[PDB]
Amino acid sequence: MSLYPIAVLIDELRNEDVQLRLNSIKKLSTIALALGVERTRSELLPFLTDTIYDEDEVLLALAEQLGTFTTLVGGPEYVHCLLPPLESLATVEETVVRDKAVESLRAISHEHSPSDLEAHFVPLVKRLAGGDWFTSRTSACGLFSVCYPRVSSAVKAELRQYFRNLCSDDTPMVRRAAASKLGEFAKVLELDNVKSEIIPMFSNLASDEQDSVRLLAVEACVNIAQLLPQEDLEALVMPTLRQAAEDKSWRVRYMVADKFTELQKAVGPEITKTDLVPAFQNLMKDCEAEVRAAASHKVKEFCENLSADCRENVIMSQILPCIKELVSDANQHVKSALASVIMGLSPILGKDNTIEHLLPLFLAQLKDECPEVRLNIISNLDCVNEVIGIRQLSQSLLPAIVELAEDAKWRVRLAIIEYMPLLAGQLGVEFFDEKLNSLCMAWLVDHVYAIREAATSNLKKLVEKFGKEWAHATIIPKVLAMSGDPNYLHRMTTLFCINVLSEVCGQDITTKHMLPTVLRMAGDPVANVRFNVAKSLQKIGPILDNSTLQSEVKPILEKLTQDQDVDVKYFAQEALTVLSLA
Amino acid sequence: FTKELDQWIEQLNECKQLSESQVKSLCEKAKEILTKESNVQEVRCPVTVCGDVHGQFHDLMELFRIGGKSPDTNYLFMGDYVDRGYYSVETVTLLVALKVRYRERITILRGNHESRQITQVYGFYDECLRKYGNANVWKYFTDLFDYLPLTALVDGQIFCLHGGLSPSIDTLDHIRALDRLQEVPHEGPMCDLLWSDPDDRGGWGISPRGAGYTFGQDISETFNHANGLTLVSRAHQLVMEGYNWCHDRNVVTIFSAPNYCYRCGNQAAIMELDDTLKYSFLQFDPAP
Amino acid sequence: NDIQWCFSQVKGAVDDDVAEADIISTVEFNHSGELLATGDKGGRVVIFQQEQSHSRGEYNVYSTFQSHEPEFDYLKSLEIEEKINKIRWLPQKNAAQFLLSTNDKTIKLWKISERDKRPEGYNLKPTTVTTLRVPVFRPMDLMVEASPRRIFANAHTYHINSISINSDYETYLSADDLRINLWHLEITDRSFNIVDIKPANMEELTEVITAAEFHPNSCNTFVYSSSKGTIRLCDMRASALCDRHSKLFEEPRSFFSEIISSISDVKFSHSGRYMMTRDYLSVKVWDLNMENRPVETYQVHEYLRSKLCSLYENDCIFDKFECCWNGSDSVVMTGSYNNFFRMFDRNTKRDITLEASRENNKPRTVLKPRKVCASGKRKKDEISVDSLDFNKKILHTAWHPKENIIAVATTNNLYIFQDKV
Amino acid sequence: XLXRXXX
Ligand SMILES: [Mn+2]
Ligand SMILES: [Mn+2]
């Protein structure tokens, strides 16, 4: 290479424009390469250490850069040269930059022979750990676990000291820092200390004055528990997690709840039925609706994980009592959360109990105002149909299904239409006919085109789920009656149903009573109804045999081409160059 | 040639604007069509009549999900397609694009905002550069706006305009007489038609807007009976409901921009006039 | 027993003819007491540094920067004034200083840092590059730069009147006439509303937030005062919304009663065990345990009590005075008219009354406690009520956090008074 | 109220 271009990149590092400055930072390998490896060590490094003063982007890159510079500096024997600049950057106010520096520090720590690692890298951690600036001290929290193993016990002794120190730091920043690295730290400590050190402090932070600090602890809970033998729990872990669930901060408690099952599956089925149930009970009855909601949206999976022996017993002696409440709750997000899974219970209490214990509730929910709630009560059918009577239900969601089928808020209506195809097969064909057919036929004459369009496309999927025969029974008779509706909208709705019912109803019925209409509609006064018939053919064309396609299909289409309506010509002449009847 | 529009529309439907090249040409095909239209465009029903859209494009999408998609459903828009919203460009182009494609399925009238002086101060102007770098696509439009029809007559019974009535206008022939191919004046009948508002204080009042006038029920009753009309169908003024009858059903206001400017929080509405001129209203909220 | 207050410095117009932009609107010492900041009607910020119980060196200009600039809403014929309403410092993160400044609609986090060196060594300083050279950092004359690092915008419908940082070193709140929002010092695109008292139908508007502060130590506590004269202590732990376990501080009439019952400022004592409040005629201390009545009530200028009418006629009844505590929550300061400011010792119970005036006193001159007469009679070395300049109000004052140093702002000038140590 | 040229 020629030097000019590199000379430029170097100068660029000290230039006004931030993008140029950012560019050279990104070509640092090519600068270090061009310099020696000893000049990189004696020239480029000193320079990059001073600075540590610009904007995120630049600093953030400089930090990431220095993380991949071990060989460029001269292999592991000099990886410690990299420390001054990374140390500097770890002091910066920007926590996104500090984050990188630490990340890089950890990376290159694994280039430190237990010697260096102990001769330089650990002094680093302590200088940071004991630094005047809380920024510095915050970054120390994340350098412990990467060098705990590879050092002498005298050292490990020290590291354990500093950490406990950082854990009692005057600044909530550091304390937070600490309580968050606790997890990855205990994971490198020998169970002795993990019970003598990690526990007392996971206990203190988890009971800090700073809400911010407490929830951070409660996270480590899980990581901590899975580093101790099941016996120890009740005395080391559970005392803390006990008060956490009783925490004054609705946020902390909320954490407990959202992390409930992750806890149980780490606290053992014993301690679960032991302590968690009395707790979980307190949550489902928490004053803060946000907590209750979180809880109620767990009740299902929490129960599917109780030891077989006690399970069915608590589910009905410990849980049920609280759910009877969570149904008549004032907060509709709570109720909405419950009803969305309250049904995953039956496949745990069997028929009888599901009929005298879950039905009175499952019923009381279904008849709730909030459309969101009763909307969930319908989403989870199969969920409980495989364990009880479809009719013992079909006599409860009578209005529920109707009510939603005709809510002022058309969105609500679109909501239930989405589910009729499923609610259908799960209620026989006759029930739909002698009940849910009146409603599925009312939507097709709905004011809102979206509901009409969504009730149309719904028919198709209401035959692939009921046989192309049932379509001729209690379906097309009406779809043809709409061709008589005095409104071209409600009328066009008829052609739209055909354009869809042809796709799945057999050429028999299709060319039977469905094609006779489309032809007759071609004489409709409203052009919007006329070109929508010329379109119905270019669509349904193929499904029909080349036989009928010649008979009266082209005669009409060639007639429409001869309409005085601009838009009717096009969809009749452009409708032929698609049916081969061109 | 058709090939492009079908596409242009499909593209604009996804909210993907057009090129200064494309626009400048669409505005051309548009002009030629719109001059062949009368100041009182004749429109046969059925038609879903719509009011103010003001660039709230996503809502214009929500409107089609309420009344239906074009050209399946005949549409009559009463002006104010640009300004206020953040998508005036994509909005006004979709519609002007549809008008050229389906000349007999859509009718676009002129709103008080489809003028130069206003588009500048109210957003369509800045938006234009902010999307093109130059004020050329704004000039091609403000120009096309001139050729827009001032009013419309549905079934020879329903009078549709953006603004309202004028003291210097009494019969439909007065309007047809007018020369609309010019910027919106600050005063005069043309101006009034696009600025007037109907209040509940008799006769002609001083428009608190600065342009046009305020007319009370008595004035409407006269105009309607004098021109054999059943109703005056207009927009221009936000109504919390989306639509609102006044002057004992002689006049009806239809606003089609829900939660105007994402601030005013109000309903939007369209009015369906069926095969036999039977009217129905559809109130919708802003698409989520 | 009384602090011997002495004149130390003056900053500003050597005379009268006050330039509007220059009128100071906020004054705040930093956590250490070394830095003293002010905020302009002109949107500027001036930081002063103490030359190097303890120190009593002069405060000299350390950094000046334009914090806010005007903004318009041409369609609404609206200008959002660049005036700096408040400044609140952040606790020392590292080598740099950080402060929050706000106007009616936008809060900005500023970084003030020192720089004593610069790079030297340009390779290209015509393609005669024989060698490559890396720049070296050489010592330069100290330089202080200020830069905005975070712009928290668009969260407020009404006028921002308060910004208070949480003890958590992480979040802070800002308040309108009707809303308080919670912010994270590093997230600028989202703000959580923790209080909203805006009536559904603005016509039924009956009360307005007036001030608001976080507890000095309790991460979950804050209070806000209203035009109605009522402080409300809130527990963010009690609920996600912060309305439960809410403690209203009230005291057991006339049209005026209401006007002078509006609280202009609220300040937690340093100990966080009490909180001072200020309304038109009085400063009154409250015990956080007792919310049925204050513990102390001091009268700042009772001679105006009879003047409520005139003061109402010329708007001064609406002037909003700020009040503050001395580090040890033992003495308490606030201001009045005719560049007079009061000081009450919660122990002694003795109160002083002083004047902020250049041509009246000079360097290290002990200040001469003032006195005011009735609406008719005059007296010896006292000033009559009917001779007070109600245009020379003192709304912004500040107290060093650990010394008997004091920043008093007059319309144009900024005075620094301290005792002899 | 967005500015009486029209909320
Ligand atoms: Mn208008
Ligand atoms: Mn309008």
Side-chain angles (χ1 to χ4, degrees), chain A, chain B, chain C residues 1-124 126-419 421, chain D:
Chain A
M1 35 34 84
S2 160
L3 310 167
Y4 195 78
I6 304 168
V8 168
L9 274 49
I10 284 175
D11 271 4
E12 235 57 322
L13 293 181
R14 159 213 188 170
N15 173 50
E16 287 287 44
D17 183 304
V18 185
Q19 289 77 305
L20 297 189
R21 244 161 57 252
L22 177 66
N23 281 345
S24 306
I25 270 288
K26 303 205 174 178
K27 293 270 279 88
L28 226 40
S29 76
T30 122
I31 272 57
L33 231 300
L35 277 299
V37 161
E38 57 318 85
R39 293 225 305 163
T40 282
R41 275 213 256 73
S42 68
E43 301 201 51
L44 193 68
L45 280 200
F47 183 71
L48 293 155
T49 295
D50 267 48
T51 160
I52 273 54
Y53 84 99
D54 278 325
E55 35 276 70
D56 280 50
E57 202 148 53
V58 176
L59 296 183
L60 194 49
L62 175 41
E64 185 182 68
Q65 205 72 307
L66 284 184
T68 76
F69 247 59
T70 310
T71 88
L72 246 173
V73 162
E77 195 164 303
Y78 315 74
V79 73
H80 73 165
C81 291
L82 292 181
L83 303 184
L86 276 169
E87 195 171 323
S88 204
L89 295 158
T91 272
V92 174
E93 14 96 304
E94 256 314 303
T95 101
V96 98
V97 169
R98 280 205 313 281
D99 274 7
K100 265 305 172 192
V102 163
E103 180 212 66
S104 292
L105 287 188
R106 294 165 73 85
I108 72 169
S109 71
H110 306 302
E111 298 292 309
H112 289 70
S113 65
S115 162
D116 313 307
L117 189 282
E118 221 183 60
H120 314 77
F121 191 103
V122 173
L124 170 60
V125 171
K126 293 180 183 181
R127 285 193 302 294
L128 288 180
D132 295 302
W133 307 329
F134 89 71
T135 47
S136 185
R137 266 135 51 208
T138 259
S139 297
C141 283
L143 293 185
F144 285 43
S145 74
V146 339
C147 72
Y148 184 70
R150 298 133 105 307
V151 282
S152 74
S153 299
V155 173
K156 295 152 144 279
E158 319 182 74
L159 304 191
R160 292 193 296 284
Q161 190 45 44
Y162 292 78
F163 197 81
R164 200 218 319 293
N165 291 162
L166 294 184
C167 280
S168 288
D169 190 69
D170 331 62
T171 291
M173 174 113 303
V174 181
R175 292 216 291 294
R176 271 195 297 275
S180 61
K181 292 312 190 170
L182 209 65
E184 72 170 29
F185 193 41
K187 182 55 184 177
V188 297
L189 299 191
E190 42 296 299
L191 186 146
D192 39 309
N193 299 320
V194 173
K195 275 169 51 185
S196 61
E197 258 63 293
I198 300 303
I199 298 294
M201 295 193 316
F202 144 99
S203 174
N204 280 267
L205 300 172
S207 48
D208 200 304
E209 155 182 40
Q210 220 60 265
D211 294 28
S212 353
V213 177
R214 307 202 293 294
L215 16 283
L216 260 159
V218 194
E219 80 69 47
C221 182
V222 161
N223 264 33
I224 279 185
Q226 316 187 330
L227 279 178
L228 304 182
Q230 203 278 350
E231 317 105 58
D232 326 274
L233 311 190
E234 183 61 52
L236 303 188
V237 159
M238 295 308 302
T240 286
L241 176 48
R242 186 166 302 106
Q243 179 187 33
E246 202 172 56
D247 190 310
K248 270 294 173 290
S249 151
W250 77 268
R251 299 211 67 179
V252 183
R253 313 207 301 271
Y254 172 96
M255 177 167 238
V256 159
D258 207 66
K259 289 287 194 180
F260 226 62
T261 79
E262 202 159 303
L263 286 177
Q264 90 184 323
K265 291 222 180 181
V267 70
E270 276 191 55
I271 326 181
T272 299
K273 173 203 164 189
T274 309
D275 291 302
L276 310 204
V277 172
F280 181 106
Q281 276 183 286
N282 288 143
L283 299 168
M284 290 198 288
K285 293 179 171 301
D286 191 317
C287 60
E288 177 47 49
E290 274 298 300
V291 183
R292 304 202 297 267
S296 306
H297 220 286
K298 276 300 201 309
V299 169
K300 188 181 179 300
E301 185 181 61
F302 179 60
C303 292
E304 300 186 332
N305 288 312
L306 290 186
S307 62
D309 45 300
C310 67
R311 170 191 289 177
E312 161 163 37
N313 205 309
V314 308
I315 285 182
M316 208 169 302
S317 178
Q318 300 319 322
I319 279 56
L320 200 84
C322 298
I323 296 183
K324 289 185 180 180
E325 284 294 327
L326 304 172
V327 175
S328 292
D329 199 291
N331 193 293
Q332 290 198 170
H333 171 48
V334 160
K335 301 183 305 179
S336 176
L338 183 53
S340 54
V341 300
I342 190 179
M343 291 299 95
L345 291 183
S346 185
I348 298 175
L349 299 185
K351 168 193 175 178
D352 286 294
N353 296 302
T354 304
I355 295 185
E356 195 197 67
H357 296 162
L358 300 194
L359 217 62
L361 305 184
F362 173 56
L363 201 174
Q365 288 220 293
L366 190 52
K367 292 186 182 184
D368 194 309
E369 291 191 309
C370 188
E372 310 291 66
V373 175
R374 77 169 86 110
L375 216 65
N376 278 308
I377 296 292
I378 311 299
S379 304
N380 300 292
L381 292 169
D382 307 295
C383 187
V384 188
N385 238 327
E386 291 162 280
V387 184
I388 61 173
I390 312 177
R391 60 150 291 196
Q392 298 301 59
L393 279 42
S394 176
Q395 296 171 297
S396 190
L397 38 163
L398 330 77
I401 301 185
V402 172
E403 221 163 58
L404 301 175
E406 55 190 61
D407 193 322
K409 321 154 72 69
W410 80 264
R411 288 286 179 188
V412 169
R413 306 203 297 279
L414 176 59
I416 189 53
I417 299 184
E418 313 290 59
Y419 299 122
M420 198 77 288
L422 283 177
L423 273 162
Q426 302 164 61
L427 287 171
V429 61
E430 70 300 71
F431 181 58
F432 185 123
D433 286 292
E434 201 180 308
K435 297 293 181 183
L436 293 47
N437 192 64
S438 71
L439 274 50
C440 233
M441 288 296 100
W443 295 330
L444 289 166
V445 63
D446 196 273
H447 297 175
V448 182
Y449 169 105
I451 291 305
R452 299 197 308 269
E453 164 154 288
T456 283
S457 39
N458 160 266
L459 294 195
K460 165 180 174 179
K461 304 294 182 181
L462 218 175
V463 169
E464 301 183 310
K465 178 70 176 171
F466 267 126
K468 77 174 58 181
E469 288 304 299
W470 178 67
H472 192 74
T474 321
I475 303 180
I476 300 185
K478 291 176 173 285
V479 175
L480 297 173
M482 277 201 288
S483 70
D485 188 305
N487 188 299
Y488 85 129
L489 298 174
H490 298 188
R491 258 151 52 206
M492 284 190 286
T493 301
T494 293
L495 304 178
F496 292 138
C497 301
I498 290 183
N499 298 28
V500 162
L501 296 179
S502 63
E503 299 166 59
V504 292
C505 249
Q507 175 183 298
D508 187 297
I509 302 182
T510 297
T511 326
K512 207 167 184 62
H513 287 155
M514 261 174 39
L515 173 57
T517 319
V518 169
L519 306 166
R520 182 168 51 69
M521 302 199 99
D524 188 277
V526 186
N528 302 64
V529 180
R530 296 211 303 288
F531 65 63
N532 271 155
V533 161
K535 288 181 176 182
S536 295
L537 305 180
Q538 187 183 307
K539 175 74 171 57
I540 67 182
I543 286 181
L544 287 180
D545 46 57
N546 186 66
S547 165
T548 318
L549 293 172
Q550 312 308 320
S551 66
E552 310 181 306
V553 168
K554 188 175 177 178
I556 304 293
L557 282 183
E558 302 192 78
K559 188 160 54 183
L560 294 186
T561 64
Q562 292 309 306
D563 222 320
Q564 62 318 73
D565 175 304
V566 193
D567 307 302
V568 168
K569 294 179 182 178
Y570 188 87
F571 288 117
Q573 171 177 298
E574 165 58 53
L576 292 180
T577 309
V578 182
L579 301 172
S580 298
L581 298 167
Chain B
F1 163 49
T2 306
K3 326 161 181 180
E4 292 190 298
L5 302 216
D6 304 66
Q7 194 297 86
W8 279 9
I9 292 174
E10 170 199 71
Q11 177 180 301
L12 276 163
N13 240 301
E14 280 155 34
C15 202
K16 298 187 184 185
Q17 74 178 65
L18 292 191
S19 69
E20 197 184 311
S21 165
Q22 304 175 298
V23 166
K24 193 265 185 51
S25 109
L26 188 65
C27 273
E28 282 292 317
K29 198 65 278 293
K31 290 181 186 185
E32 276 158 54
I33 288 183
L34 303 192
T35 340
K36 281 176 192 167
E37 299 211 335
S38 176
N39 288 357
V40 185
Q41 186 58 17
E42 214 65 58
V43 184
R44 72 137 46 204
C45 70
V47 217
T48 294
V49 177
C50 312
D52 276 62
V53 169
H54 285 297
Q56 308 185 181
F57 179 103
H58 282 74
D59 299 324
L60 164 61
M61 292 302 93
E62 173 86 341
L63 187 162
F64 290 140
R65 275 199 297 281
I66 293 298
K69 321 188 197 71
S70 174
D72 289 296
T73 297
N74 283 317
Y75 278 112
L76 181 46
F77 292 99
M78 310 189 268
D80 280 19
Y81 314 103
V82 299
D83 290 0
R84 291 311 201 171
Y86 181 58
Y87 299 85
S88 298
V89 172
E90 295 75 60
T91 298
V92 76
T93 300
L94 172 52
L95 300 176
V96 180
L98 291 156
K99 174 57 178 186
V100 176
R101 182 68 185 61
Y102 309 113
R103 340 174 81 185
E104 323 300 313
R105 264 90 274 288
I106 327 175
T107 306
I108 43 168
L109 300 181
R110 180 166 182 167
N112 70 312
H113 281 254
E114 272 75 38
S115 89
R116 300 182 179 72
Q117 171 163 174
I118 301 295
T119 48
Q120 335 221 70
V121 163
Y122 286 89
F124 184 47
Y125 182 75
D126 288 323
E127 192 183 308
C128 268
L129 281 59
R130 188 182 71 55
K131 303 202 175 184
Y132 285 120
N134 52 71
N136 286 60
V137 176
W138 168 90
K139 168 169 161 52
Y140 306 138
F141 276 145
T142 34
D143 280 42
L144 168 48
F145 292 164
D146 283 303
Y147 295 80
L148 283 168
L150 296 196
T151 70
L153 194 57
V154 192
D155 241 51
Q157 307 185 61
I158 309 175
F159 188 52
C160 300
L161 65 172
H162 179 72
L165 302 165
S166 164
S168 5
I169 275 194
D170 307 308
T171 78
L172 302 194
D173 282 305
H174 286 158
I175 300 172
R176 295 197 194 77
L178 288 177
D179 167 42
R180 79 191 200 229
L181 301 180
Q182 82 192 324
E183 174 80 356
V184 186
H186 291 155
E187 300 192 63
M190 177 180 202
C191 164
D192 299 338
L193 288 174
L194 292 57
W195 286 81
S196 308
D197 299 298
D199 52 38
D200 57 12
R201 56 187 178 76
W204 299 96
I206 306 163
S207 177
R209 303 239 208 179
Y213 298 76
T214 57
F215 45 103
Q217 196 190 323
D218 52 283
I219 294 177
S220 301
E221 296 176 307
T222 308
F223 187 76
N224 281 329
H225 302 170
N227 304 276
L229 306 167
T230 305
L231 174 59
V232 147
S233 187
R234 50 86 68 155
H236 189 58
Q237 287 193 326
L238 170 85
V239 272
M240 220 58 79
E241 298 290 49
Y243 74 96
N244 165 62
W245 297 96
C246 68
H247 296 184
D248 203 61
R249 306 230 165 180
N250 274 289
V251 172
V252 70
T253 294
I254 307 169
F255 207 76
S256 294
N259 184 40
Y260 183 44
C261 290
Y262 316 57
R263 303 272 195 185
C264 293
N266 52 283
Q267 295 194 273
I270 36 183
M271 178 184 74
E272 299 198 312
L273 296 183
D274 81 340
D275 298 62
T276 60
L277 257 197
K278 314 251 65 178
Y279 64 64
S280 54
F281 294 117
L282 288 169
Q283 303 177 297
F284 60 109
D285 288 299
Chain C
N1 51 160
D2 259 37
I3 326 180
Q4 202 63 168
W5 281 122
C6 274
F7 170 127
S8 171
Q9 299 172 273
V10 223
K11 307 278 185 186
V14 57
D15 70 309
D16 268 59
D17 203 43
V18 193
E20 280 266 315
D22 292 312
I23 308 174
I24 295 166
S25 47
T26 195
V27 176
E28 195 89 331
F29 281 101
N30 71 337
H31 292 48
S32 88
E34 301 179 52
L35 304 174
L36 176 55
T38 59
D40 266 46
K41 206 184 180 174
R44 296 156 279 174
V45 161
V46 182
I47 304 191
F48 294 97
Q49 179 194 53
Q50 184 168 55
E51 189 64 65
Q52 58 262 65
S53 190
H54 223 67
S55 190
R56 288 268 177 302
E58 305 207 303
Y59 276 80
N60 304 311
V61 174
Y62 181 68
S63 169
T64 296
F65 61 94
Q66 183 75 27
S67 158
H68 286 53
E69 261 156 17
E71 301 212 322
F72 303 92
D73 186 311
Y74 297 116
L75 287 181
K76 290 187 183 176
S77 307
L78 234 44
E79 149 171 40
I80 303 81
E81 296 157 56
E82 91 258 46
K83 172 190 158 210
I84 308 309
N85 297 336
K86 296 280 172 299
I87 293 187
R88 288 292 121 109
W89 295 83
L90 292 189
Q92 200 95 11
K93 204 163 291 172
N94 52 33
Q97 223 64 29
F98 292 78
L99 64 78
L100 279 188
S101 70
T102 186
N103 70 316
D104 270 4
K105 304 281 169 176
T106 297
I107 308 104
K108 295 174 190 181
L109 171 61
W110 287 87
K111 170 179 182 191
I112 316 295
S113 55
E114 289 180 42
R115 191 178 80 189
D116 60 23
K117 72 191 185 201
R118 60 189 165 209
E120 177 191 281
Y122 273 124
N123 280 298
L124 286 50
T127 312
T128 311
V129 181
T130 314
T131 332
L132 292 171
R133 227 58 204 177
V134 160
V136 226
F137 274 101
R138 292 207 179 186
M140 74 165 309
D141 271 51
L142 205 172
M143 202 177 99
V144 177
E145 294 168 300
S147 68
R149 309 257 99 167
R150 214 70 85 176
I151 312 288
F152 313 78
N154 307 290
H156 290 271
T157 279
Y158 301 96
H159 292 192
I160 297 181
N161 64 50
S162 321
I163 51 168
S164 183
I165 68 180
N166 192 291
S167 57
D168 67 6
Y169 278 52
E170 198 181 58
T171 58
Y172 77 86
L173 65 82
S174 64
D176 283 349
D177 297 64
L178 313 165
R179 293 169 204 160
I180 313 206
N181 294 314
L182 186 66
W183 301 80
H184 270 267
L185 295 168
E186 291 201 309
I187 301 168
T188 200
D189 56 289
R190 307 131 58 185
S191 183
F192 180 78
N193 175 289
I194 63 192
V195 172
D196 186 351
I197 67 179
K198 161 175 154 59
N201 57 328
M202 219 58 259
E203 190 178 294
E204 279 190 298
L205 177 64
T206 184
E207 188 184 44
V208 109
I209 298 175
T210 212
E213 192 166 69
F214 257 144
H215 186 283
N217 308 108
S218 296
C219 87
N220 61 309
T221 314
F222 67 83
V223 309
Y224 67 93
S225 41
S226 71
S227 32
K228 265 246 180 52
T230 69
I231 321 79
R232 176 180 295 288
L233 198 152
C234 304
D235 201 322
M236 296 183 96
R237 283 175 179 167
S239 53
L241 306 181
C242 309
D243 40 306
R244 182 202 166 184
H245 212 66
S246 173
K247 300 178 200 171
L248 173 39
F249 286 61
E250 257 186 64
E251 214 170 323
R253 189 67 171 182
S254 162
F255 150 70
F256 286 150
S257 292
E258 304 198 302
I259 288 170
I260 50 173
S261 70
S262 181
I263 293 176
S264 56
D265 193 13
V266 187
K267 301 279 185 47
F268 275 114
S269 66
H270 282 88
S271 55
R273 197 64 195 203
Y274 313 78
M275 73 183 172
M276 181 165 26
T277 248
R278 166 83 193 245
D279 58 60
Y280 205 80
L281 296 167
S282 70
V283 163
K284 80 174 60 159
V285 190
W286 302 69
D287 174 302
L288 301 180
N289 301 307
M290 196 178 149
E291 68 240 58
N292 43 297
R293 274 191 188 181
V295 154
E296 302 156 51
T297 287
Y298 300 75
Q299 310 186 325
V300 53
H301 43 206
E302 206 61 54
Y303 49 72
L304 289 184
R305 231 277 161 37
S306 54
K307 303 305 153 56
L308 292 245
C309 277
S310 47
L311 294 177
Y312 166 83
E313 326 289 49
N314 69 20
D315 295 311
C316 312
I317 210 151
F318 305 105
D319 292 342
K320 306 179 86 264
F321 284 92
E322 307 170 325
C323 58
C324 64
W325 307 78
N326 64 172
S328 44
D329 315 316
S330 34
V331 179
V332 128
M333 166 185 214
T334 193
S336 188
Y337 307 86
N338 212 81
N339 297 339
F340 288 154
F341 52 112
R342 317 266 283 119
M343 293 201 75
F344 314 81
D345 183 312
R346 298 173 75 205
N347 295 328
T348 298
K349 288 293 176 175
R350 278 218 290 175
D351 67 51
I352 312 171
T353 277
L354 307 182
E355 189 185 70
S357 179
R358 183 181 293 154
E359 307 195 327
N360 242 291
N361 329 66
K362 271 304 86 179
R364 68 267 208 65
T365 293
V366 176
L367 294 187
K368 331 208 64 182
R370 299 322 184 80
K371 225 177 172 187
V372 175
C373 316
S375 294
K377 304 127 298 179
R378 230 182 291 81
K379 305 179 185 186
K380 55 168 177 178
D381 289 313
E382 319 209 314
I383 160 163
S384 164
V385 153
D386 306 291
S387 320
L388 295 179
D389 195 344
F390 291 68
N391 279 2
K392 299 194 202 175
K393 46 200 78 175
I394 290 189
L395 319 179
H396 318 306
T397 144
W399 202 319
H400 186 298
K402 292 233 139 68
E403 297 296 316
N404 290 311
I405 308 183
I406 233 179
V408 184
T410 259
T411 199
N412 39 32
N413 326 298
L414 169 81
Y415 300 82
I416 283 191
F417 306 129
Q418 31 154 32
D419 75 344
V421 63
Chain D
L2 302 161
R4 36 203 64 76

